[PDB]
C-alpha cells in the first residue's frame, strides 16, 4: 500500500590516499535502481532497474551532474566540520545523508525526509513539518542558522511535496509489474536434533518481496519470543529476501510449536508445523 | 529524481 523513494549518500575522507570517496544509491521501496561511485573511470550515474532505463540521456546527464555536485559539497562540508569540531586533518571521517518521501494509496505525500550524520551520529535533520530543523549539538546549530537564512527548507518542502511524489508515481507505473506486485514467501520447517532430550525447529521464509515480514513461533498459542533466535532479514541476491526463526524445543513435543508468518503477498497469515 | 540544491554546512 505505502510506497517510498529514498536516496542515500556516504562520503569518507582518505587523507593522503587521494580524494574522499563518494557513493550514492537510490531505492524505490526495497528495489535499487540508480547508483554512483566516485572511484570509477569517468564516474556517471548508472541504472540498476529495468524500468529506469527508459529515461532519456538528458535525465542521466542531470543525475550525474547532481551526484558530482553533491560529492563536491561533501568535500567542503567535511573540511567545514573539521573546523566546527576541532578535529585533525589526518583522520578519516564519514558524512552520511538520506532524503526521501513516503506516499500512500492516494498518491499524495505522507511523510518527508532529509537528514545528515557525521561519524555515525546525527547532525541536522528536517522536521516532519518540512519547515524546521533539529540540530544535534551547537556545531549543527551553526549550520541550522545558515540553512534558515538561505531558506533551504522551502526548496526541500517544494521538492518533497512535488517532484519526489510525482517522479515516484512515475517509477511505480513504469515498473508496475515488479514494484506494485508483491512476492509472497516460500515457507517450510526443518528439524535439527541437538541432543537426545533437546532439538531445534527452524521456520524458513525464502524469496519474498518486499523485505517486511514477521516470523513468530508459538507454544500452544503463546509466543516463544524470548526463546526464539531470529536473524536479520537478508537479501537473496535477486531483489528478493530471506528470513528464518528457530526455537529450542524439548524432544518429543515438536507438535506443540507453530510458526506464524505474515507478509503483504500472502492472502492470509500462515500457520505451519513440522511435518515428519 | 534527485533534488537540485546546494546547501553547504
Amino acid at each position, epitope marked *: 500500500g505505502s510506497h517510498s523513494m529514498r536516496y542515500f549518500h556516504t562520503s569518507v575522507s582518505r587523507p593522503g590516499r587521494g580524494e574522499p570517496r563518494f557513493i550514492t544509491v537510490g531505492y524505490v521501496d526495497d528495489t535499487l535502481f540508480v547508483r554512483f561511485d566516485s572511484d570509477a573511470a569517468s564516474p556517471r550515474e548508472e541504472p540498476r532497474a529495468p524500468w529506469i532505463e527508459q529515461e532519456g540521456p*538528458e535525465y542521466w*546527464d*542531470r543525475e550525474t*551532474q547532481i551526484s558530482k*555536485a553533491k560529492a563536491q559539497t561533501d568535500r567542503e562540508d567535511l573540511r567545514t566540520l573539521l573546523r566546527y569540531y576541532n578535529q585533525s586533518e589526518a583522520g578519516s571521517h564519514t558524512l552520511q545523508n538520506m532524503y526521501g518521501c513516503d506516499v500512500g494509496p492516494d498518491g499524495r505525500l505522507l511523510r518527508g525526509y532529509h537528514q545528515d550524520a557525521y561519524d555515525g551520529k546525527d547532525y541536522i535533520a528536517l522536521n516532519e513539518d518540512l519547515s524546521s530543523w533539529t540540530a544535534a549539538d551547537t556545531a549543527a546549530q551553526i549550520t541550522q542558522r*545558515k540553512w534558515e*537564512a*538561505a*531558506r*533551504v527548507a*522551502e*526548496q526541500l518542502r*517544494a*521538492y518533497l511535496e*512535488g*517532484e519526489c511524489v510525482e517522479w515516484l508515481r512515475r517509477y511505480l507505473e513504469n515498473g508496475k509489474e515488479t514494484l506494485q506486485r508483491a512476492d509472497p514467501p516460500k515457507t517450510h520447517v526443518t528439524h535439527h536434533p541437538i541432543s537426545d532430550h533437546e532439538a531445534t525447529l527452524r521456520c524458513w521464509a525464502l524469496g519474498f518481496y518486499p523485505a517486511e515480514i514477521t516470523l513468530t513461533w508459538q507454544r500452544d498459542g503463546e509466543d516463544q519470543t524470548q526463546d526464539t533466535e531470529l536473524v536479520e532479514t537478508r537479501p537473496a541476491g535477486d531483489r528478493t529476501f530471506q528470513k528464518w526463526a528457530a526455537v529450542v524445543v524439548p524432544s518429543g513435543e515438536e507438535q506443540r510449536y507453530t510458526c506464524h508468518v505474515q507478509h503483504e503477498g500472502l492472502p492470509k497469515p500462515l500457520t505451519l508445523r513440522w511435518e515428519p | 529524481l534527485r*533534488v*537540485m*540544491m*546546494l*546547501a*553547504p554546512f
Partner: T-cell receptor
Amino acid sequence: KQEVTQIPAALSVPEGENLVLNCSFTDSAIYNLQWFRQDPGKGLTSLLLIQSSQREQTSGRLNASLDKSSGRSTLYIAASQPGDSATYLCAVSNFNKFYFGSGTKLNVKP
Amino acid sequence: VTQTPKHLITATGQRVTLRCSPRSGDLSVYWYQQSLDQGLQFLIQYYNGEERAKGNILERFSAQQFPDLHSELNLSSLELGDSALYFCASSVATYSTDTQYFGPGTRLTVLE
C-alpha cells in the same frame, strides 16, 4: 546549452493595468529562477526567487509562475504603479554558471 | 555592495582595474558584464578566496578574491567592444536557495 529569451522587449501601459511578462529557457536543469528590476543608478534588485521545485512565488503585487518541463516562467504584475517602471530581467542558475534574459523595459503611464 | 571606480573613460590598448567590496559576512563575489550586443553576461565567481565558477571570460581579463573577501578585476589591452557595464554581486555563500545582491556598477567607455 541554455538560452533565456524575454518577450516583449518594451512595454508602455497605463497605471492600474495588470501585466504579464513571459520568460522562456531551453535547459530545464536549473537551481532556481529570479526576476530582477534594473533602474539606472542602483542596478539590479531582486524581486522574486522561485526555488527549483517551487511552481509559484508571490510578494505583494508580484506573482510569478515556473514550469521547468515546458521551460517557461511568467511574472504577473497587479495594479501597475508608476514606480514599477523599469527593465525586468529574467535570471536562471544552471550547473556551470548563471544566464540572464534579454530584458523587458516597462513604462507605467500615469 | 560597493564598487570602484564609478565611471571610466579610456582609449584602446590601455589597462583598467575594477575593484569590488561585497557585503560584510558574504564569502562569494560575482562579476558581470552588461554590453548592448550580449546583454548581461556572467564572467567569473569566487567563493571564500577561491575560484568556483567561470563563464566566457577572456584571457586578457584577470580577477582575484583577496583574503579580506574583496575582489579585483583587471581588464587589459582594451578594445572598443569592452565598453560595457561591469557589475559586482555577492551572496552569503554558494546556496542555490538564496539570492545575489548587486552593486551600483562601473561604466567603461573605450574610445579609439
